[PDB]
Amino acid sequence: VEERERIEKQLLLEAERINEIDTLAKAHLSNHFNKEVLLAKGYTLKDIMQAQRRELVRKFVPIEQIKAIAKVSDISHIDGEILEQLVSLAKVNIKLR
Amino acid sequence: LSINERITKELAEVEERERIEKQLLLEAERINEIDTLAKAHLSNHFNKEVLLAKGYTLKDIMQAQRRELVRKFVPIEQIKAIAKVSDISHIDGEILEQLVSLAKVNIKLRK
Amino acid sequence: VEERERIEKQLLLEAERINEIDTLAKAHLSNHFNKEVLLAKGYTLKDIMQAQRRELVRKFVPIEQIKAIAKVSDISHIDGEILEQLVSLAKVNIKLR
Amino acid sequence: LSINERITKELAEVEERERIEKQLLLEAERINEIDTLAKAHLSNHFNKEVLLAKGYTLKDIMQAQRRELVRKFVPIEQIKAIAKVSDISHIDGEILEQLVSLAKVNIKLRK
Amino acid sequence: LSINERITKELAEVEERERIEKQLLLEAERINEIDTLAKAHLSNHFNKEVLLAKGYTLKDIMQAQRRELVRKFVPIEQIKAIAKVSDISHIDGEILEQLVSLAKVNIKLRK
Amino acid sequence: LSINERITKELAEVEERERIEKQLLLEAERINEIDTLAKAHLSNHFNKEVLLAKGYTLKDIMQAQRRELVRKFVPIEQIKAIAKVSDISHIDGEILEQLVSLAKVNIKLRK
């Protein structure tokens, strides 16, 4: 049952990450990308989170840094470790902002 | 071995040689970019001649110049974000390539 | 895989040599012998590099050294490490120039 | 032709061997300098003549003279710190060259 | 693979791990010596905390402290004759170990 | 054998003797060129008479004269471009021929 306990630990970790991302995105980007309206438009939870992350990058991380770390100007398909780097860069930019 | 096999082998060999040629051009461009960045933004102590005299491989010279450029231009929080850590002691590689693209971005915005 | 690693090392070495040759030839000879226009005219990369080297010899290395060290006045067919000697002499000439 | 340039490479390697002959000559000069150090700072019993009579190789004579000079001039604290060990009996080599350099410095400052 | 081969492989593995452990302990003691020398003989501005904040590797901190200690204690003639040059900026290594040993005994004789 | 075997043998023997004669003429021209160069550009102490009295082979005389001519005319900026090191004390052959050709060019442009 400790396997399920650790699974629940990881669930709590990603839930906290999602909550933090949503809380900062609501105050930073817009309310058009709210979880409720995105779900109504028909996007899965992970798709909503990654779209919010990409918007956070496009807002805080300027397009030059975007293409610098993402190695491609379009964040449409860079998702993964590069996307995590970019969202941490967005966190850094808002920290220094 | 029929004619279709002969032609496809010949074209595959030609395309492989052309791809190797493109790789040579890309590596030449990388060398030019590293030399220009080292001459423009980094100190004379990190020159290729003195590093080779100290006994470092060419790739080691490239990654050392890249790391210095990242530390000079890329702020430490940006490093903690992209590299996911502060220390660039062993971060050399494609993450370092992203970080040096960031360094060139920083010099473009700094000019 | 270390065989392919050393092959890539040799690729890097020749790429660096091509870089040095190009960075001096563009500023020394002309824009007519640019890599793009030569490729459009239809010359392979090795042919382009050897033609540029021969032009470098014809610009810096004097004809007496061409007909004495390389034994032929025409650099059209002398290619090899004799061409290496000629381009080294051209490097010395441009260094002293 | 290809033969001309390959023979050029051959004689360039001969030229490198000539440089090896020069560095051999330089090593011989270092040998005579160590001999002068041994005469100036060590007992007559450690002379090359008596050591050869006892039957020791020339390199053995040089390393014995170097070890004695290090023990005489370089204090044991530096000796221990440098060799990472107190004993010099198995420290012949580049570390020994560094130690005899330190001994030369010690006699220079002593004078 | 016979019994003797098994025993020799096991013994070699054990000895290798023991040597690695000894190397770790030696690095520990080296970190000690750098820390104590920096605290006792060098200014607060060269502390590991502030140097790491400025963004220097641990090895860079160690060699910088060593070079500063050598300049502070070891005289310039001694430097010029040990390292064969006045500048210590490119003498990190075994010769740096020699200069820092000379400083270590210099402070002992100063006391 | 049919007569065609000698139609090639008879001609081969004559051609071999003709090539040997041409080689003898080439050697004579080489000796004449060495004599002229030694008389014109090198000191009297390097004359064939005094060198033979000191007991050196004719080929040794030729290579010594060539080496002295190379050192006198060809500067190090080409000696290290062809032989790759400055001195040619033990170096002679194809690089020596290239260097004496370069020295002939050098004296021609000097005049």
PDB file of N, CA, C and O in Angstrom, chain B residues 6-38:
ATOM      1  N   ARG B   6      20.525  -0.457 -57.380  1.00  0.00           N
ATOM      2  CA  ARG B   6      21.725   0.313 -57.701  1.00  0.00           C
ATOM      3  C   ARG B   6      21.477   1.812 -57.563  1.00  0.00           C
ATOM      4  O   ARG B   6      22.269   2.532 -56.940  1.00  0.00           O
ATOM      5  N   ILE B   7      20.367   2.299 -58.124  1.00  0.00           N
ATOM      6  CA  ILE B   7      20.066   3.727 -58.076  1.00  0.00           C
ATOM      7  C   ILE B   7      19.812   4.182 -56.646  1.00  0.00           C
ATOM      8  O   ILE B   7      20.286   5.247 -56.231  1.00  0.00           O
ATOM      9  N   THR B   8      19.056   3.401 -55.866  1.00  0.00           N
ATOM     10  CA  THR B   8      18.789   3.830 -54.499  1.00  0.00           C
ATOM     11  C   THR B   8      20.058   3.815 -53.655  1.00  0.00           C
ATOM     12  O   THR B   8      20.241   4.699 -52.816  1.00  0.00           O
ATOM     13  N   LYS B   9      20.963   2.858 -53.887  1.00  0.00           N
ATOM     14  CA  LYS B   9      22.235   2.871 -53.172  1.00  0.00           C
ATOM     15  C   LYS B   9      23.069   4.089 -53.552  1.00  0.00           C
ATOM     16  O   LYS B   9      23.663   4.738 -52.682  1.00  0.00           O
ATOM     17  N   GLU B  10      23.122   4.417 -54.847  1.00  0.00           N
ATOM     18  CA  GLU B  10      23.893   5.576 -55.286  1.00  0.00           C
ATOM     19  C   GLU B  10      23.338   6.869 -54.696  1.00  0.00           C
ATOM     20  O   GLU B  10      24.091   7.711 -54.191  1.00  0.00           O
ATOM     21  N   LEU B  11      22.014   7.040 -54.750  1.00  0.00           N
ATOM     22  CA  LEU B  11      21.397   8.239 -54.188  1.00  0.00           C
ATOM     23  C   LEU B  11      21.558   8.298 -52.673  1.00  0.00           C
ATOM     24  O   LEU B  11      21.766   9.379 -52.114  1.00  0.00           O
ATOM     25  N   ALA B  12      21.466   7.153 -51.988  1.00  0.00           N
ATOM     26  CA  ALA B  12      21.679   7.145 -50.546  1.00  0.00           C
ATOM     27  C   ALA B  12      23.102   7.557 -50.200  1.00  0.00           C
ATOM     28  O   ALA B  12      23.321   8.337 -49.266  1.00  0.00           O
ATOM     29  N   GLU B  13      24.086   7.050 -50.947  1.00  0.00           N
ATOM     30  CA  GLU B  13      25.472   7.444 -50.712  1.00  0.00           C
ATOM     31  C   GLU B  13      25.675   8.932 -50.973  1.00  0.00           C
ATOM     32  O   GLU B  13      26.350   9.622 -50.196  1.00  0.00           O
ATOM     33  N   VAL B  14      25.094   9.445 -52.062  1.00  0.00           N
ATOM     34  CA  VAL B  14      25.239  10.862 -52.386  1.00  0.00           C
ATOM     35  C   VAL B  14      24.619  11.726 -51.293  1.00  0.00           C
ATOM     36  O   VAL B  14      25.210  12.722 -50.857  1.00  0.00           O
ATOM     37  N   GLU B  15      23.423  11.355 -50.831  1.00  0.00           N
ATOM     38  CA  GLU B  15      22.764  12.118 -49.776  1.00  0.00           C
ATOM     39  C   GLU B  15      23.537  12.037 -48.466  1.00  0.00           C
ATOM     40  O   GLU B  15      23.594  13.017 -47.717  1.00  0.00           O
ATOM     41  N   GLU B  16      24.131  10.879 -48.165  1.00  0.00           N
ATOM     42  CA  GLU B  16      24.945  10.765 -46.960  1.00  0.00           C
ATOM     43  C   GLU B  16      26.165  11.677 -47.029  1.00  0.00           C
ATOM     44  O   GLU B  16      26.502  12.351 -46.047  1.00  0.00           O
ATOM     45  N   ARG B  17      26.835  11.716 -48.184  1.00  0.00           N
ATOM     46  CA  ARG B  17      27.977  12.615 -48.332  1.00  0.00           C
ATOM     47  C   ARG B  17      27.549  14.075 -48.230  1.00  0.00           C
ATOM     48  O   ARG B  17      28.248  14.894 -47.621  1.00  0.00           O
ATOM     49  N   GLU B  18      26.397  14.421 -48.811  1.00  0.00           N
ATOM     50  CA  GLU B  18      25.904  15.790 -48.707  1.00  0.00           C
ATOM     51  C   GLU B  18      25.562  16.150 -47.264  1.00  0.00           C
ATOM     52  O   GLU B  18      25.794  17.282 -46.827  1.00  0.00           O
ATOM     53  N   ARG B  19      24.994  15.203 -46.513  1.00  0.00           N
ATOM     54  CA  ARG B  19      24.689  15.454 -45.108  1.00  0.00           C
ATOM     55  C   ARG B  19      25.964  15.633 -44.292  1.00  0.00           C
ATOM     56  O   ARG B  19      26.021  16.486 -43.397  1.00  0.00           O
ATOM     57  N   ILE B  20      26.997  14.838 -44.581  1.00  0.00           N
ATOM     58  CA  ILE B  20      28.287  15.031 -43.919  1.00  0.00           C
ATOM     59  C   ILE B  20      28.851  16.406 -44.253  1.00  0.00           C
ATOM     60  O   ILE B  20      29.427  17.087 -43.396  1.00  0.00           O
ATOM     61  N   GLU B  21      28.692  16.835 -45.507  1.00  0.00           N
ATOM     62  CA  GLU B  21      29.134  18.169 -45.907  1.00  0.00           C
ATOM     63  C   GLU B  21      28.392  19.260 -45.139  1.00  0.00           C
ATOM     64  O   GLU B  21      29.000  20.239 -44.680  1.00  0.00           O
ATOM     65  N   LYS B  22      27.074  19.110 -44.996  1.00  0.00           N
ATOM     66  CA  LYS B  22      26.293  20.070 -44.221  1.00  0.00           C
ATOM     67  C   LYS B  22      26.736  20.082 -42.764  1.00  0.00           C
ATOM     68  O   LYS B  22      26.768  21.140 -42.126  1.00  0.00           O
ATOM     69  N   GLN B  23      27.067  18.911 -42.218  1.00  0.00           N
ATOM     70  CA  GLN B  23      27.588  18.849 -40.856  1.00  0.00           C
ATOM     71  C   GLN B  23      28.913  19.595 -40.743  1.00  0.00           C
ATOM     72  O   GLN B  23      29.155  20.295 -39.754  1.00  0.00           O
ATOM     73  N   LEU B  24      29.785  19.454 -41.746  1.00  0.00           N
ATOM     74  CA  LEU B  24      31.035  20.212 -41.753  1.00  0.00           C
ATOM     75  C   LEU B  24      30.772  21.711 -41.759  1.00  0.00           C
ATOM     76  O   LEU B  24      31.415  22.466 -41.020  1.00  0.00           O
ATOM     77  N   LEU B  25      29.832  22.160 -42.593  1.00  0.00           N
ATOM     78  CA  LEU B  25      29.497  23.582 -42.617  1.00  0.00           C
ATOM     79  C   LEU B  25      28.956  24.044 -41.270  1.00  0.00           C
ATOM     80  O   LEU B  25      29.306  25.129 -40.789  1.00  0.00           O
ATOM     81  N   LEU B  26      28.102  23.230 -40.644  1.00  0.00           N
ATOM     82  CA  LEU B  26      27.545  23.593 -39.345  1.00  0.00           C
ATOM     83  C   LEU B  26      28.633  23.700 -38.283  1.00  0.00           C
ATOM     84  O   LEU B  26      28.626  24.630 -37.470  1.00  0.00           O
ATOM     85  N   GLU B  27      29.576  22.755 -38.273  1.00  0.00           N
ATOM     86  CA  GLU B  27      30.665  22.818 -37.301  1.00  0.00           C
ATOM     87  C   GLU B  27      31.565  24.021 -37.555  1.00  0.00           C
ATOM     88  O   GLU B  27      32.058  24.645 -36.605  1.00  0.00           O
ATOM     89  N   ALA B  28      31.794  24.362 -38.826  1.00  0.00           N
ATOM     90  CA  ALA B  28      32.562  25.566 -39.135  1.00  0.00           C
ATOM     91  C   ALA B  28      31.856  26.813 -38.620  1.00  0.00           C
ATOM     92  O   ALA B  28      32.496  27.715 -38.060  1.00  0.00           O
ATOM     93  N   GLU B  29      30.534  26.884 -38.799  1.00  0.00           N
ATOM     94  CA  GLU B  29      29.776  28.013 -38.267  1.00  0.00           C
ATOM     95  C   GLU B  29      29.852  28.062 -36.746  1.00  0.00           C
ATOM     96  O   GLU B  29      29.959  29.145 -36.159  1.00  0.00           O
ATOM     97  N   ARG B  30      29.782  26.901 -36.090  1.00  0.00           N
ATOM     98  CA  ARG B  30      29.916  26.864 -34.635  1.00  0.00           C
ATOM     99  C   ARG B  30      31.276  27.388 -34.193  1.00  0.00           C
ATOM    100  O   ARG B  30      31.370  28.156 -33.228  1.00  0.00           O
ATOM    101  N   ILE B  31      32.342  26.977 -34.884  1.00  0.00           N
ATOM    102  CA  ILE B  31      33.681  27.456 -34.547  1.00  0.00           C
ATOM    103  C   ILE B  31      33.766  28.965 -34.723  1.00  0.00           C
ATOM    104  O   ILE B  31      34.323  29.675 -33.875  1.00  0.00           O
ATOM    105  N   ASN B  32      33.221  29.481 -35.829  1.00  0.00           N
ATOM    106  CA  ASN B  32      33.240  30.922 -36.060  1.00  0.00           C
ATOM    107  C   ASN B  32      32.484  31.668 -34.966  1.00  0.00           C
ATOM    108  O   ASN B  32      32.961  32.691 -34.458  1.00  0.00           O
ATOM    109  N   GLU B  33      31.304  31.169 -34.591  1.00  0.00           N
ATOM    110  CA  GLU B  33      30.517  31.823 -33.549  1.00  0.00           C
ATOM    111  C   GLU B  33      31.251  31.816 -32.216  1.00  0.00           C
ATOM    112  O   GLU B  33      31.271  32.828 -31.506  1.00  0.00           O
ATOM    113  N   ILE B  34      31.864  30.683 -31.857  1.00  0.00           N
ATOM    114  CA  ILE B  34      32.595  30.608 -30.594  1.00  0.00           C
ATOM    115  C   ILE B  34      33.771  31.575 -30.601  1.00  0.00           C
ATOM    116  O   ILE B  34      34.023  32.274 -29.611  1.00  0.00           O
ATOM    117  N   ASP B  35      34.511  31.630 -31.712  1.00  0.00           N
ATOM    118  CA  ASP B  35      35.652  32.537 -31.797  1.00  0.00           C
ATOM    119  C   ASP B  35      35.208  33.990 -31.662  1.00  0.00           C
ATOM    120  O   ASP B  35      35.819  34.772 -30.921  1.00  0.00           O
ATOM    121  N   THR B  36      34.136  34.367 -32.365  1.00  0.00           N
ATOM    122  CA  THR B  36      33.655  35.743 -32.288  1.00  0.00           C
ATOM    123  C   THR B  36      33.173  36.086 -30.884  1.00  0.00           C
ATOM    124  O   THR B  36      33.473  37.169 -30.366  1.00  0.00           O
ATOM    125  N   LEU B  37      32.428  35.178 -30.248  1.00  0.00           N
ATOM    126  CA  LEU B  37      31.938  35.441 -28.899  1.00  0.00           C
ATOM    127  C   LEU B  37      33.090  35.578 -27.911  1.00  0.00           C
ATOM    128  O   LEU B  37      33.086  36.478 -27.062  1.00  0.00           O
ATOM    129  N   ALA B  38      34.089  34.696 -28.010  1.00  0.00           N
ATOM    130  CA  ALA B  38      35.237  34.772 -27.112  1.00  0.00           C
ATOM    131  C   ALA B  38      36.018  36.062 -27.318  1.00  0.00           C
ATOM    132  O   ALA B  38      36.467  36.685 -26.349  1.00  0.00           O
TER     133      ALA B  38
END
